[PDB]
Enzyme design. Structure first.
Site, PDB file in Angstrom:
ATOM      1  N   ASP A  35      -5.079 -29.161   6.768  1.00 37.50           N
ATOM      2  CA  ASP A  35      -5.751 -28.476   5.661  1.00 37.50           C
ATOM      3  C   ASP A  35      -6.476 -27.240   6.182  1.00 37.50           C
ATOM      4  O   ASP A  35      -7.596 -27.345   6.688  1.00 37.50           O
ATOM      5  CB  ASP A  35      -6.737 -29.429   4.990  1.00 37.50           C
ATOM      6  CG  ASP A  35      -7.471 -28.791   3.827  1.00 37.50           C
ATOM      7  OD1 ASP A  35      -7.051 -27.697   3.403  1.00 37.50           O
ATOM      8  OD2 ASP A  35      -8.457 -29.414   3.357  1.00 37.50           O
ATOM      9  N   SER A 199      -4.724  -9.846  -0.630  1.00 39.83           N
ATOM     10  CA  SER A 199      -3.382  -9.427  -0.982  1.00 39.83           C
ATOM     11  C   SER A 199      -3.420  -8.058  -1.650  1.00 39.83           C
ATOM     12  O   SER A 199      -4.377  -7.701  -2.340  1.00 39.83           O
ATOM     13  CB  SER A 199      -2.749 -10.471  -1.907  1.00 39.83           C
ATOM     14  OG  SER A 199      -1.501 -10.046  -2.414  1.00 39.83           O
TER      15      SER A 199
END
Length: 330
Positions: A35, A199
């Site tokens: 994770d 992004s």
């Protein structure tokens, strides 16, 4: 040193991935959910409340000659999906894919919430976010990667998750045969303890690319792709009959649909998520309403590049003094 371990989807939907981890002496192998959105290595154990164990493999520290109680240490964690677990702490030897750390904090669960009990395939979590998020008190503990870093050939790990197929976690090296083209690296903020990056935009299907900054986290422990409501609406508007359902808890679409791809920007590079990766199947057995793999982050507080996005790429988690993330197509 290096390590290399195969990671395997837990079910036919890629709801999560499990990776075998050796703990203790002699080794006890548990299948952990790696994770990158959390920083605790915790396991089902001989200390877990018996009614909360249903098929998981447990770590038994009393059978490990290298286990030592970390006296006074406790841990308690809550995840973004509302699940939680807590317990006490041992140090022990932990190996992943041939890479061994001695003295790793192994957090033994005394209590786990229902969603963990109900998932017999996940024996615990191995956190790979930054150690500043580790919950052990009163002495915070380091992640497996942080402990291994100095010994690694290169201070990196990579995630190469498969679509409906096994993939690989590598530690200490970049497998240049595992991706196509070049790796595009992008800046990371560690201020929230995550692999947080920006992004450069998105496209839906064959549509034109929209240049826009989307801050979010690379999170192997989250199944889906969670993005701003504007982006998610633009995606689902291209699917006839798709709608946001408050009763189901997100966007659903007709199971008869063919889904468009979704592209996200990494610097000037582009990662294409095929439409099929966005199908999470019937909302309930036999339903013709299917659950979408791109969902709004509006209720979260952060955008999350979960498995739906990451499995479309070869992803480098670069833990150099100034961390960065790398993405390549594959």
């Amino acid at each position: 040193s290096t390590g290399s371990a195969t990671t395997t989807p837990i079910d036919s939907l890629d709801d999560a991935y499990i990776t075998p981890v050796q703990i203790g002496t002699p080794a006890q192998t548990l299948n952990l959910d790696f994770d990158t959105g959390s920083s605790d290595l915790w396991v089902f154990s001989s200390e877990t409340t018996a009614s909360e164990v249903d098929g998981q493999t447990i770590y038994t520290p009393s059978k490990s000659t290298t286990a030592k109680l970390l006296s006074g240490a406790t841990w308690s964690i809550s995840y973004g999906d509302g699940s939680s677990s807590s317990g006490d702490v041992y140090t022990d030897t932990v190996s992943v894919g041939g890479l061994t750390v001695t003295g790793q904090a192994v957090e033994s669960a005394k209590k786990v919430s229902s969603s963990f009990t109900e998932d017999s395939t996940i024996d615990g979590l191995l956190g790979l976010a930054f150690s500043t998020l580790n919950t052990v008190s009163p002495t915070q503990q380091k992640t497996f990667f942080d402990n291994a870093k100095a010994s690694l050939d290169s201070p990196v790990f990579t995630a190469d998750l498969g679509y409906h197929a096994p993939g690989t976690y590598n530690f200490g090296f970049i497998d240049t045969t595992a991706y196509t083209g070049s790796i595009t690296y992008t800046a990371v903020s560690t201020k929230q303890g995550f692999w947080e990056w920006t992004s450069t935009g998105y496209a839906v299907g064959s549509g034109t690319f929209k240049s826009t900054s989307i801050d979010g986290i690379a999170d192997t422990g989250t199944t889906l792709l969670y993005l701003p409501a504007t982006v998610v609406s633009a995606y689902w508007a291209q699917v006839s009959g798709a709608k946001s359902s408050s009763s189901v808890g997100g966007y659903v679409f007709p199971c008869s649909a063919t889904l468009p791809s979704f592209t996200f920007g990494v610097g000037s590079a582009r990662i294409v998520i095929p439409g099929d990766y966005i199908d999470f199947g019937p909302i309930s057995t036999g339903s013709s309403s299917c659950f979408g793999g791109i969902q709004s982050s509006a209720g979260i507080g952060i955008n999350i590049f979960g498995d739906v996005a990451l499995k479309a790429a070869f992803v480098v988690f670069n833990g150099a003094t100034t961390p960065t993330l790398g993405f390549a197509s594959k």
